[PDB]
Design a protein around this ligand. Structure first.
Ligand SMILES: CN1CCN(NCCN2c3ccccc3Sc3ccc(Cl)cc32)CC1
Ligand SMILES: [Ca+2]
Ligand SMILES: [Ca+2]
Ligand SMILES: [Ca+2]
Length: 169
């Protein structure tokens, strides 16, 4: 069930009110009786808004960011925290979240491949490499074929295309 200390934490750490959090919890438990949102279920959530294409790979990429302790489950607290950031975060928070989405192997850098990875995922859910390379080449200042968080942040606050594609701009 929903412990008071979970509520206390979430009402302090997120942009949701206690009432909203309780409303989300009833819905969360209805869909996930064990309190655990799995990758399978997360995909079916996306399949519900993108029946046209195949949002499997995009949803999987989003899943690993939601799942912050990497145990293969999104518990309710992980769910609310990620939802808070992506729907109500300030520009810096949404950028940082965006960065973690692109940084697939979580090494703190975005490579071209990883940027290809996401754009492909977006495509399957809904020349392309050339436009990406162009934007990546523009963001990569010291020309090392990596994008640090700072390179990605400043690049997006000048060319927000890579970020808006994630509906976070
Ligand atoms: C790259 N991503 C970053 C996060 N962004 N927002 C949150 C994702 N999210 C969602 C979140 C939790 C549970 C279910 C869903 S389903 C859903 C449907 C449409 C949208 Cl536009 C977003 C979502 C969508 C774009
Ligand atoms: Ca987890
Ligand atoms: Ca990486
Ligand atoms: Ca760089």
């Amino acid at each position: 069930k929903l412990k008071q200390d979970t509520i206390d934490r979430l009402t302090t750490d997120t942009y949701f009110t206690e009432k909203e959090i309780r409303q989300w919890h009833k819905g969360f438990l209805k869909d996930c009786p064990n309190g655990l949102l799995t990758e399978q279920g997360f995909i079916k959530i996306y399949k519900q808004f993108f029946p046209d294409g195949d949002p499997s790979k995009f949803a999987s990429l989003v899943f690993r960011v939601f799942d912050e302790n990497n145990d293969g489950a999104i518990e309710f607290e992980e769910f609310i925290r990620a939802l808070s950031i992506t729907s109500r975060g300030n520009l810096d928070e949404k950028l940082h979240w965006a960065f973690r989405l692109y940084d697939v192997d979580n090494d703190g850098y975005i490579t071209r491949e990883e940027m290809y990875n996401i754009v492909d995922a977006i495509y399957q859910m809904v020349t392309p490499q050339k436009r990406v390379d162009k934007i990546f080449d523009q963001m990569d200042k010291n020309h090392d074929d990596r994008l640090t968080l700072e390179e990605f942040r400043e690049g997006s606050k000048a060319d927000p295309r890579m970020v808006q594609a994630l509906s976070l701009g």
